[PDB]
């Protein structure tokens, strides 16, 4: 269609899976309370100085988070944000700041359960925010205490219980700091993944999300596409809990859009093996061809699921390559013994039969590629079942030109992609340029 | 030898460790069963609805894996693969598909132990596949239940046991999803590392591999070079177990091949400090010089161990640099206070004595580098024991030219490697080019 697939296959770019394009949007929110400190009432006789030291260390961790959150809460009034008081912010910080303000309308109800949050003695409990709303409290290490320390009070010495508690708390903080430590300069954000907030509950995000009652057909893709996120909207440094707003978006199918994967196959040119350097994921919207940074997206067999639009510009030469101008397609020399030397597409086999041994199962005859050919197309109009190494493939028919193997193409320029090679090429061209100029 | 080490050392590229080159190959395989769901018989009175919800969530995770595996199992017949039915595949997917077919010959025997797999109540058990073969079943969370929940049935309330089980299962799934979730679009693969499959057993790959009876001199290098891999060959969504084929290859020493490390040392040129931009790992095979992507390989003091051939092309100018044309070697300006200013090789010290203070321990005299010199070579024909800062080094003798310090070289062009600088340099050269053209 839009990509000139026949000429592209001739330079090792075999049409791969066509995937549809999705972006997360329109999220609904829920608030959950994470208690950052366990209830040690049932082990209290043997806690010693542990909880006192724990609370001090934890306050140091949570305090700068609370501060950054308050900065926005003290600047937004009713919903107008004090741009002067904020001074410097990105659009993302401002938007998150608005979401923060709105969230406080509910955080204020949750906070009236302060004493009911303090008293929770189970890993997960149900409190009433309002008669019509529930808020759950997830408590760090509460299960550890309830099943590992409480039953052991009269089995191990009292001092050993103290040490066991101290270590459980210290390990919790060591893991907690990666996310809730100094790295979190922007707690006023709605882009922070839920798997990163669940660290406050031991990394157990499945319990967190199940507790909230969320389960959808697209749920696992939303998780691994980093679309389910949360925002810390409130921090309590006396009771040691945080209120987290969790965003549950839906995936919007982008209309007239898809991501086309190309399967890179080495090919022959001038008695050497080459691989083409083009995007192996081309994003097409309407009739526009652009690049996509799929390294930030979840790729399934059916779709590319992104948490934002990751479309990027493409040069004119690459677009011209993709639409048929193979003289514009860069190639890198293959020096490695481990590259794709063939690919299957549409039931048709595209292979470099100079670098692999292509034998026909039906006749026992070799499939011979001439020096002038890049790849051979092997389909069942020539060989119904083909052997490549120890792999036997039953082939279909090619729906493109019957003369595919009889027509040569222009092949583009050699390039080198090593980061060092890029610097070398720039300075070399620059010296040639100075001679010319 | 092949690299012009004497001229290279003069631009800050001091010969480092010569390592031999290895690639994993010829793997032998074993099948192991991982039970994805614990046996709760001894806690069954207090499991509530937990296992029912667990199984549903787990089926959602395993179901798409089973589906992708069946796609190939339904297309391969006897070993011919239905290229038409597959439609689109890479050589790697096709090869893995063949391995999958072969694996089923044994999976079919393991599956006859279905009821014996269901009944396992220990983290590791030994079942008979055939009279002459054993298959082990590794069970997720079985130890947790056997030592943490079973002994506590009459110590904690029944409801607390239910919650403890629910959390253990939920944490397991939260960790499991990173690998066995939507990210695994290609379960039909034999390149997936064993440390990634062991997640199905809590990440405990040492138990998995010990159970299989594998232990070799090269075992730890195979693990950290990502050479020990497995393939999911069978998924059972009723009994909740997977059959994993584990590949145990051997390391093949590549003949007439080595990787030469260069130790980058800053040097003086035109009253400023420079670092050379060349590959710091040069792969040499026979007499060919190429680049190696060691970022994907395990580097030990003796060898570079790769799970495939990671050789890449090198430009003519870089190769010319490495073979003695120092006018072709790019240099980047040093603006940082933390760069290597010296290196030790062969017992000989190569140092930029303009940027460091080089003092001779034997005489108390300063070692003076002139403006025309890049580096000084300090060996024991000049100073037997030398002081660089607070480091005292007893030196050997240089086996190259005695006039090393007396002979100047051409120094190549300045470059900038910042990603922004690369874009800037390209557009700047392009405008100069348009003036010329």
């Amino acid at each position: 269609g839009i990509l000139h697939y026949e000429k592209l296959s001739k330079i090792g770019l075999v049409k791969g899976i066509t995937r549809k394009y999705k972006i997360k949007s329109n999220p609904l929110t829920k608030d959950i309370v994470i208690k950052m400190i366990p209830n040690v009432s049932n082990v209290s006789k043997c806690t010693g100085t542990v909880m006192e030291n724990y609370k001090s260390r934890l306050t140091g961790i949570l305090s700068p988070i609370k501060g950054a959150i308050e900065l926005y809460n003290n600047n937004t009034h009713d919903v107008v944000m004090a741009g002067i008081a904020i001074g410097i912010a990105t659009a993302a910080q401002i938007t998150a700041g608005v979401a923060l303000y709105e969230a406080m309308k509910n955080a204020d109800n949750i906070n009236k359960l302060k004493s009911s949050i303090e008293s929770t003695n189970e890993a997960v409990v149900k409190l009433q925010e309002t008669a019509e709303k529930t808020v759950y409290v997830l408590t760090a290490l509460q299960d550890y205490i309830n099943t590992n320390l409480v039953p052991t009070i009269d089995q191990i010495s009292c001092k050993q219980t103290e040490l066991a508690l101290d270590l459980a708390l210290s390990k919790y903080l060591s893991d907690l700091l990666f996310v809730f430590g100094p790295n979190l300069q922007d707690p006023v954000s709605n882009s922070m993944t839920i798997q990163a907030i669940s660290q406050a509950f031991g990394g157990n995000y499945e319990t967190l999300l199940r507790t909230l009652g969320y389960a959808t057909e697209d749920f696992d893709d939303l998780l691994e596409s980093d679309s389910i996120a949360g925002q810390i909207v409130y921090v309590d440094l006396s009771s040691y809990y945080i209120i987290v707003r969790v965003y549950f978006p839906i995936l919007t199918e982008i209309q007239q859009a898809y991501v086309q994967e190309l399967l890179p196959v080495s090919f022959n040119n001038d008695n050497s093996e080459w691989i083409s350097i083009v995007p192996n994921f081309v994003l097409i919207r309407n009739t526009l061809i652009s690049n996509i940074e799929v390294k930030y997206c979840l790729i399934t067999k059916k779709s590319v699921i992104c948490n934002q639009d990751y479309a990027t510009p493409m040069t004119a030469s690459v677009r011209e390559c993709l639409t048929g101008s193979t003289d514009k397609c860069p190639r890198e020399l293959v020096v490695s013994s481990h590259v794709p030397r063939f690919a299957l597409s549409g039931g048709v086999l595209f292979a470099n039969c100079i670098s692999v041994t292509c034998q026909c199962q039906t006749t026992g005859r070799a499939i011979s590629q001439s020096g002038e050919q890049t790849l051979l197309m092997i389909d069942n109009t020539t060989c119904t079942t083909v052997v490549l190494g120890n792999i036997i493939i039953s082939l279909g028919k090619y729906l493109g030109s019957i003369n595919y193997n009889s027509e040569s193409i222009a092949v583009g320029p050699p390039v080198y992609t090593d980061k060092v090679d890029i610097s070398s090429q720039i300075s070399s061209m620059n010296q040639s340029l100075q001679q010319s100029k | 030898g092949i690299l012009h080490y004497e001229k290279l050392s003069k631009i800050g590229l001091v010969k480092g460790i010569t390592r031999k080159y290895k690639i994993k190959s010829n793997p032998l395989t074993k099948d192991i069963v991982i039970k994805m769901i614990p046996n709760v018989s001894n806690v069954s009175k207090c499991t509530g609805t937990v296992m029912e919800n667990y199984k549903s969530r787990l089926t959602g995770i395993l179901s798409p894996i089973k589906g992708a595996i069946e796609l190939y199992n339904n297309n391969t017949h006897d070993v011919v693969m239905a290229g038409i039915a597959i439609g689109i595949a890479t050589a790697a997917q096709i090869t893995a598909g063949v391995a999958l077919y072969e694996a089923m010959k044994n999976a079919d025997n393991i599956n006859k132990l279905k009821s014996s797999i269901e009944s396992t109540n220990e983290a590791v058990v030994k079942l008979q596949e055939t009279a002459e073969k054993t298959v082990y079943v590794l069970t997720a969370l079985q130890d947790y239940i056997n030592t943490n929940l079973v002994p506590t049935i009459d110590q904690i309330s029944c409801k607390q046991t239910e919650l403890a089980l629910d959390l253990a299962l939920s944490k397991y799934l939260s960790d499991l999803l990173f690998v066995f979730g939507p990210n695994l679009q290609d379960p039909v693969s034999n390149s997936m590392t064993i440390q990634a499959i062991s997640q199905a057993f809590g990440g405990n790959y040492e138990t998995l591999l010990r159970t299989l009876g594998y232990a070799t001199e090269d075992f730890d290098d195979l693990l950290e070079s990502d050479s020990i891999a497995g393939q999911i060959v069978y998924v059972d969504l009723s009994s909740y177990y997977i059959i994993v084929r584990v590949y145990f290859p051997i390391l093949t020493e590549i003949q007439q091949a080595y990787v030469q490390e260069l130790l980058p040392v800053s040097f003086n040129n035109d009253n400023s400090e420079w670092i050379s931009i060349v590959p710091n790992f040069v792969l040499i095979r026979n007499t060919l010089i190429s680049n190696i992507e060691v970022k994907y390989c395990l580097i030990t003091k003796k060898s570079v161990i790769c799970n495939q051939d990671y050789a890449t092309p090198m430009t003519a100018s870089v190769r010319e640099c490495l073979t003695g044309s120092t006018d072709k070697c790019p240099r980047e300006l040093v603006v940082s206070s933390h760069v290597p200013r010296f290196a030790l090789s062969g017992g000989v010290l190569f140092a930029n004595c303009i940027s460091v203070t080089c003092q001779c321990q034997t005489t108390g005299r300063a070692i003076s580098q002139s403006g025309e010199q890049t580096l000084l070579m300090i060996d024991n024909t000049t100073c037997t024991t030398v002081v660089l800062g607070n480091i005292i080094i007893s030196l050997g003798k240089y086996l190259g030219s005695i006039n090393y310090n007396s002979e100047s070289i051409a120094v190549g062009p300045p470059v900038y490697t910042d990603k922004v600088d690369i874009s800037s340099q390209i557009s700047s050269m392009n405008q100069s080019l348009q003036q010329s053209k």
Epitope: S25, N26, L28, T29, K30, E132, K133, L212, G213, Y214, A215, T216, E217, F248, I250, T252 | N53, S56, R57, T59, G60
Partner: antibody, heavy 117, light 107 residues
């Protein structure tokens, strides 16, 4: 405290375009939630038709995907169900409902507009 | 779509006795919601997320289930329970309802 009140013609001819309006009081149609349409057939069988979200995005029941459009009018705090063309089978009581995260269910329902075709 | 079925279509119970209303799904869902429709009124959420009681719902109601099988239990059935109870899933699109079961009160 949302009162969803739907209204429209109680009778349209075959091949006419149907337009039902759901007036919402007590909450802004643009600030939150998903705004749904559901219809109940004479046999009391319930069918979900689709929704428009707070930002204007749509999600429809595939069986009638090519005949349905759910839109909003923020200035009146209303949302609308439009069917490009109606068929005799489309005789049903049409309800509007609010979907949200509190229950992950449609909780507030209107009274229903009984439509004859 | 996911088809929800609720058989038998009509059930009956005496005053004061428990009755279980059931639902089966053609494909697994994680949660099931239940709605109660009394004559002359729109369906009103009864049970949400399988086991929870909605805003104005009497303690007589409860529920459970997983995967493809769910139930709505009415303890101590009374006259106000004479309604069409619907099984609803929102797990996959389109969102669907079962045909609904009518609970008759014996007199």
């Amino acid at each position: 405290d949302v009162q969803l009140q739907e209204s429209g013609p109680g009778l349209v001819k075959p091949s006419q375009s149907l337009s039902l309006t759901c007036s919402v009081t007590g909450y802004s149609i643009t600030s939150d939630y998903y705004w749904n349409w559901i219809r109940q057939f004479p046999g009391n069988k319930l069918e979900w038709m689709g929704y428009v979200t707070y930002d204007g995005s749509n999600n429809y029941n595939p069986s009638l995907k090519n005949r349905i459009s759910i839109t909003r009018d923020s200035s009146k705090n209303q949302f609308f169900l439009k069917l490009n063309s109606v068929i005799s089978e489309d005789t049903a009581t049409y309800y509007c409902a609010r979907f949200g995260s509190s229950y992950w269910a449609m909780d507030y329902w209107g009274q229903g507009t009984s439509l004859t075709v | 779509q996911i088809v929800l079925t609720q058989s038998p279509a009509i059930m009956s119970a005496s005053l004061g006795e428990a009755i279980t209303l059931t639902c089966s799904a053609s494909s697994s869902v994680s949660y099931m919601h239940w709605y109660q429709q009394k004559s002359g009124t729109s369906p009103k959420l009864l049970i949400y997320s399988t086991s929870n009681l909605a805003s104005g719902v009497p303690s007589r109601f409860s529920g459970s289930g997983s995967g493809t099988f769910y139930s709505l239990t009415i303890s101590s059935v009374e006259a106000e329970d004479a309604a069409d109870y619907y099984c609803h899933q929102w797990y996959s699109y389109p969102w669907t309802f079962g045909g609904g079961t009518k609970l008759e009160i014996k007199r």
